[PDB]
Paper text:
PA4063 crystallized in two different forms corresponding to space groups P41212 and P65. The asymmetric unit of the hexagonal crystal comprises three protein molecules, but the interactions are so limited that they can be considered as simple packing contacts between monomers as in the case of the tetragonal crystal form.
The structural and zinc-binding properties of PA4063, one of the periplasmic proteins expressed by Pseudomonas aeruginosa under zinc-deficient conditions, are presented. PA4063 has a noncanonical ferredoxin-like fold. Two zinc-binding sites with micromolar affinity are exposed and are located on the same face of the structure.
Residue numbers in the entry: 19 to 96, 121 to 179
Write the structure that this text describes.
């Protein structure tokens, strides 16, 4: 139950890249057949489309979404989910702490998240888990 997250904080710009097996987010590795499959896909799509909620960005930072991409056949019009987010924060000084607590609540099949961070300070790695879901930005 292992996802990657790449974070990049340069000034106003916050970039988030999630790479996860479909299993963690949707509950299965096939394309969507049954009603129960189509409803799990739609629940995951709706959640991944609200990144300020899923990554619990603090409202005080003034974060807004400039772009977001879901790359998977599950989310196209016709075995890995990629989710790319470009955010812009009016007060990025207030981004002190990234919490994946909400990601773990909304996708409880995710047991561990490997985070890479890149910032004016350099590169930083951490393994996050429901137990310790926080990372100093």
């Amino acid at each position: 139950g292992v996802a990657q997250l790449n974070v990049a904080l340069d000034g106003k710009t916050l970039e988030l890249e999630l790479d996860s097996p479909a299993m963690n987010l949707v509950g299965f590795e096939h394309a969507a057949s049954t009603d129960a499959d189509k409803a799990a896909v739609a629940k995951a799509r709706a959640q991944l489309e609200k990144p300020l909620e899923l990554f619990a960005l603090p409202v005080t930072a003034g974060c807004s979404v400039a772009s977001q991409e879901l790359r998977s056949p599950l989310f196209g019009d016709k075995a890995d989910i990629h989710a790319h987010y470009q955010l812009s924060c009016e007060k990025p000084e207030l981004l002190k702490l990234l919490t994946l607590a909400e990601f773990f609540k909304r996708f409880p099949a995710t047991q561990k998240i490997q985070v890479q961070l890149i910032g004016p300070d350099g590169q930083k790695g951490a393994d996050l888990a429901p137990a310790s879901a926080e990372l100093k930005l």
